[PDB]
Amino acid sequence: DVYAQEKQDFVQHFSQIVRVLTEDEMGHPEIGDAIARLKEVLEYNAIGGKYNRGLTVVVAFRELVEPRKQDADSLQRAWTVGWCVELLQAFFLVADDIMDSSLTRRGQICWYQKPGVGLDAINDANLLEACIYRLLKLYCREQPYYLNLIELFLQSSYQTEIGQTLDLLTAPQGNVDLVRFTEKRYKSIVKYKTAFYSFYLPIAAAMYMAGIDGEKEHANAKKILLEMGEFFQIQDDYLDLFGDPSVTGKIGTDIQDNKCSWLVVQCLQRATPEQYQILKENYGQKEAEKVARVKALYEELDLPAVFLQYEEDSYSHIMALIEQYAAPLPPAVFLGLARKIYKRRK
Amino acid sequence: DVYAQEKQDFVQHFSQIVRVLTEDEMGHPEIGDAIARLKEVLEYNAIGGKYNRGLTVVVAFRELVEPRKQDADSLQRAWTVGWCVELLQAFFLVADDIMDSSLTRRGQICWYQKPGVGLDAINDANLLEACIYRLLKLYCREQPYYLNLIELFLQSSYQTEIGQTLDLLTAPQGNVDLVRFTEKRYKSIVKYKTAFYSFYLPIAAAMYMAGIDGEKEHANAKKILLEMGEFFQIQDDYLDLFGDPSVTGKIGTDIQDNKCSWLVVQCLQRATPEQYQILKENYGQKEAEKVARVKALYEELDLPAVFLQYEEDSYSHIMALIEQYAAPLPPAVFLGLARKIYKRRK
Ligand SMILES: CC(C)Oc1ccc(-c2ccnc(NC(P(=O)(O)O)P(=O)(O)O)c2)cc1
Ligand SMILES: CC(C)Oc1ccc(-c2ccnc(NC(P(=O)(O)O)P(=O)(O)O)c2)cc1
Numbered sequence: 001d002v003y004a005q006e007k008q009d010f011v012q013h014f015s016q017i018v019r020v021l022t023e024d025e026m027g028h029p030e031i032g033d034a035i036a037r038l039k040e041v042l043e044y045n046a047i048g049g050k051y052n053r054g055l056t057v058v059v060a061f062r063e064l065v066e067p068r069k070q071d072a073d074s075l076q077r078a079w080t081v082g083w084c085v086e087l088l089q090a091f092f093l094v095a096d097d098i099m100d101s102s103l104t105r106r107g108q109i110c111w112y113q114k115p116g117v118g119l120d121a122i123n124d125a126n127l128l129e130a131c132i133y134r135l136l137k138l139y140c141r142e143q144p145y146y147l148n149l150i151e152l153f154l155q156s157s158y159q160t161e162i163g164q165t166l167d168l169l170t171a172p173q174g175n176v177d178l179v180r181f182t183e184k185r186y187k188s189i190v191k192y193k194t195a196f197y198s199f200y201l202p203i204a205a206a207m208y209m210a211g212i213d214g215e216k217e218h219a220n221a222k223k224i225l226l227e228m229g230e231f232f233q234i235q236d237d238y239l240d241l242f243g244d245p246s247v248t249g250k251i252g253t254d255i256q257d258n259k260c261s262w263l264v265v266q267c268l269q270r271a272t273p274e275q276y277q278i279l280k281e282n283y284g285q286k287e288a289e290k291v292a293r294v295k296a297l298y299e300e301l302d303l304p305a306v307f308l309q310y311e312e313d314s315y316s317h318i319m320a321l322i323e324q325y326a327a328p329l330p331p332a333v334f335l336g337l338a339r340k341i342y343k344r345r346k
Numbered sequence: 347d348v349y350a351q352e353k354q355d356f357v358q359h360f361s362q363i364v365r366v367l368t369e370d371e372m373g374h375p376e377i378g379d380a381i382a383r384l385k386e387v388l389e390y391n392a393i394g395g396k397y398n399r400g401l402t403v404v405v406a407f408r409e410l411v412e413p414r415k416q417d418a419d420s421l422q423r424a425w426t427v428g429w430c431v432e433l434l435q436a437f438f439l440v441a442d443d444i445m446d447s448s449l450t451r452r453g454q455i456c457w458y459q460k461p462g463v464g465l466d467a468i469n470d471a472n473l474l475e476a477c478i479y480r481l482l483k484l485y486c487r488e489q490p491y492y493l494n495l496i497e498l499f500l501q502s503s504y505q506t507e508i509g510q511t512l513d514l515l516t517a518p519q520g521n522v523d524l525v526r527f528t529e530k531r532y533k534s535i536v537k538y539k540t541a542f543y544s545f546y547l548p549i550a551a552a553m554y555m556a557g558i559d560g561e562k563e564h565a566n567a568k569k570i571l572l573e574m575g576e577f578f579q580i581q582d583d584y585l586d587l588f589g590d591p592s593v594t595g596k597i598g599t600d601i602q603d604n605k606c607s608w609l610v611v612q613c614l615q616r617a618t619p620e621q622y623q624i625l626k627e628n629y630g631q632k633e634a635e636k637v638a639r640v641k642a643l644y645e646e647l648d649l650p651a652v653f654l655q656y657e658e659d660s661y662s663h664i665m666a667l668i669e670q671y672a673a674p675l676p677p678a679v680f681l682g683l684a685r686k687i688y689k690r691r692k
C-alpha cells in the first residue's frame with residue numbers, strides 16, 4: 001500500500017545514484033572505461049526487482065522521523081541509504097547466480113551468463129558492494145549515525161556470507177545429503193543468509209538514521225524481523241519450484257543444486273520409506289527427468305497446500321510478535337513490510 | 347633485512363588471528379560448520395606468500411611510534427592490522443585466480459581448483475574480506491584512528507577493484523586487443539590494481555595508527571608508494587613468464603589471458619611490422635605452441651635485458667622520490683620496503 005505509493009518515487013532516484021557514482025569520470029579520466037563498466041553493471045543488476053529493502057528504509061524513515069525533521073537533505077540521505085541496501089542485494093545476487101548456476105534473474109539472463117561477461121562478474125559483484133560505502137561516505141559522513149551505518153552494513157554482509165557458507169556446505173554437488181536436511185539446520189541457514197540483510201538491516205538503518213540507537217530497541221525489532229525473514233525465505237523456496245518464471249523473473253535450481261530447501265525438509269518429514277528412496281535416487285542431480293520426479297513427489301505429498309497452511313500460521317505468529325515487540329515504534333513500520341510480503345507471488 | 351627479522355614473529359601471530367576469528371563457535375553453535383569452513387579458508391589462503399604488506403605495517407609502525415608508546419596492546423593492534431592487509435590480499439588472490447583461470451598459487455593448487463571447492467570459492471573470498479572489518483572492530487574500535495582505518499581499507503578495495511576492472515576490460519578473451527596495450531594504459535591499470543593496496547595501504551595504516559593523519563603527509567607518502575607499486579607490478583609481469591614456478595609458487599597465464607602485461611607493451615614498442623604479426627596471430631590464446639611462440643619473440647627481442655635496465659633506472663627514480671618526499675618520516679620506512687622488493691625473484 002504505502003510501498004506501492006513510494007515505488008515510482010524510489011526508482012526515479014536511481015538516475016541520481018548512477019550519476020554520482022560515475023562522477024569521478026571528469027576528475028580522473030584514466031578510469032573512464034572502468035566507470036563506464038560500473039554504470040553498465042549498475043543498470044543491469046540494480047534494477048528490475050521489487051525494491052522491497054530500499055523501499056523499507058524510505059518508508060520506515062518517514063514513519064520514524066518527526067515530519068518537521070524531514071527536510072530535503074534528510075530525505076535524500078534516506079533514499080540514498082535505501083539504494084545502498086539495494087546495491088548490497090545486487091552484489092549478493094550476481095555472485096549467487098554464479099554459485100547456483102542460475103539462468104535468469106528479474107526477467108532477464110543472469111549477468112554472468114551474458115556473452116562477454118562470464119566470471120568477470122565476480123569483480124562486477126564486488127564493485128557493487130564498494131558503491132555502498134562510497135555513497136555512505138558522500139552523503140552521511142557528517143551525520144552522527146555514520147559509523148553505526150558502516151558497521152551495520154559490514155556486519156550484515158558478514159552474517160549473510162556465513163549464511164551462504166551454511167547453504168553451500170549443506171548442498172554438496174555430486175553427494176546425497178538427505179540426512180542433513182533438518183528443520184533445525186534449515187532455520188539456521190535462512191536466519192543468516194536472508195533474514196539479517198533483507199529484514200533487520202533496512203529497518204535498523206532507518207532506526208539509526210532516526211537517532212534510535214539503543215540495544216534494547218534494536219533487539220526487539222530484530223525478534224520480529226528475523227522471524228519475518230525466515231518466513232520470506234520459505235516463500236522464496238516455494239517459489240523456486242512452484243512459481244511462474246514469467247512472474248518471479250527467475251528459473252528454479254534448488255533441486256538440481258541439492259539445496260536444503262524448505263520443500264525438501266517438509267518432504268522428508270512426511271515421506272514413506274519408499275518415497276524417501278525416490279527422493280534419494282532423484283534429488284541433487286542435473287537430469288530434467290530426475291527434477292520432474294522430485295516435483296511430482298512434492299505434489300503427491302500436497303506440499304503446496306502444506307505451504308499455504310504454514311504461511312497462515314507463521315503470519316499469525318509474526319503478527320503476535322509485532323503485538324509483543326513493536327513498542328515504542330509504530331506497528332505500521334513492521335506491518336507495511338509484512339503486508340508487502342504476505343501471499344507474494346514474486 | 348628488518349623484514350627478514352620480523353618474519354617469524356609475524357607468522358607466529360597467525361594462530362591467534364585464526365583463534366579470535368573462529369571464537370564465535372562457542373556462543374553460536376548453529377554456525378559451527380561455517381566457522382570450521384572459514385578456518386579452512388584462512389589456513390589455505392592466508393599463508394604461504396611473502397607477507398610483505400603485513401610486515402610493512404608492523405615495521406613501519408615500530409619505526410613511526412616512539413618506543414615508549416609501543417606497549418603490548420599497541421604492538422598487538424599493529425600486527426593485527428598487518429594481518430588485515432594480508433586478509434585483503436587473500437581475498438583478492440582467491441577471486442583473481444578464478445578470473446585469470448590460474449592453476450597454482452604460493453606453491454599449491456589454487457583454492458578454487460581443489461575438488462569440492464570450485465565456484466564456492468567466490469563466497470570464501472568474500473568471507474576473507476569480511477574478517478578484516480571483524481578484526482578492526484575487535485581490536486581498534488576504541489582507538490582515535492578506527493574510522494580512518496575502516497575508510498582506508500574500503501577505499502583501497504574500491505581503487506583495487508577499479509584497477510581489476512581496467513585489467514579485465516583491456517584483456518577480452520577471444521579478441522585481439524593489441525591497439526589497447528599502451529604505456530599510458532598499462533600505468534593506469536597497475537596504479538589502481540596493485541599500487542594503492544600493496545604499497546600505499548600498509549604504510550598509510552601504520553601512519554594513521556601513529557597518529558599521522560595529515561593530508562600533506564599522506565599525499566607525500568603516496569607519491570613514493572605509487573611509483574613503488576608500479577615498479578612491483580612490472581616485476582610481477584616479468585615473473586609471470588620468466589620466473590621459476592617452483593620459486594614464484596605460481597604458473598603464468600598473462601599471454602593466454604590476453605593481458606596488458608608490461609612485457610607485451612615493451613614488445614609492441616620494439617616490434618618490426620613482421621614480428622607485430624607474430625604477436626597478433628599468437629597472443630591471447632590457450633594453445634601451448636602459441637604461448638611458446640610469443641615467449642620466443644620476447645627472448646628474440648632481449649626483453650629480459652630490457653627488464654633489468656628498466657628496473658635499475660626505476661629503482662634509482664624511486665630512491666630520488668624518497669629523497670624528495672620522505673620527510674618528516676624516516677627514510678628507512680620506504681627504504682626497507684624498496685630493498686625488500688628490489689631484484690626479487692618471487
Ligand atoms: C559474497 C556473496 C557470495 O555472498 C552472498 C551472495 C548471495 C546470498 C544470498 C542470500 C539470500 N538469497 C540469495 N539468493 C536466493 P535466490 O537465487 O534469488 O532464489 P537463494 O540462492 O538463497 O535461494 C542469495 C548470500 C551471500
Ligand atoms: C573483487 C576482486 C575480484 O578484486 C580484485 C582481485 C584481485 C586483484 C589483484 C590485484 C593485483 N594483482 C593480482 N594478481 C596478480 P597475480 O595472479 O598474483 O600475478 P595479476 O592477475 O594482476 O597479474 C590481483 C584486484 C582486485
Ligand SMILES: [Mg+2]
Nearest residue numbers: 096099100167
Ligand atoms: Mg543460493
Ligand SMILES: [Mg+2]
Nearest residue numbers: 096097100102
Ligand atoms: Mg540462488
Ligand SMILES: [Mg+2]
Nearest residue numbers: 236237240254
Ligand atoms: Mg531461492
Ligand SMILES: [Mg+2]
Nearest residue numbers: 442445446513
Ligand atoms: Mg589478474
Ligand SMILES: [Mg+2]
Nearest residue numbers: 442443446448
Ligand atoms: Mg592473476
Ligand SMILES: [Mg+2]
Nearest residue numbers: 582583586600
Ligand atoms: Mg601477475
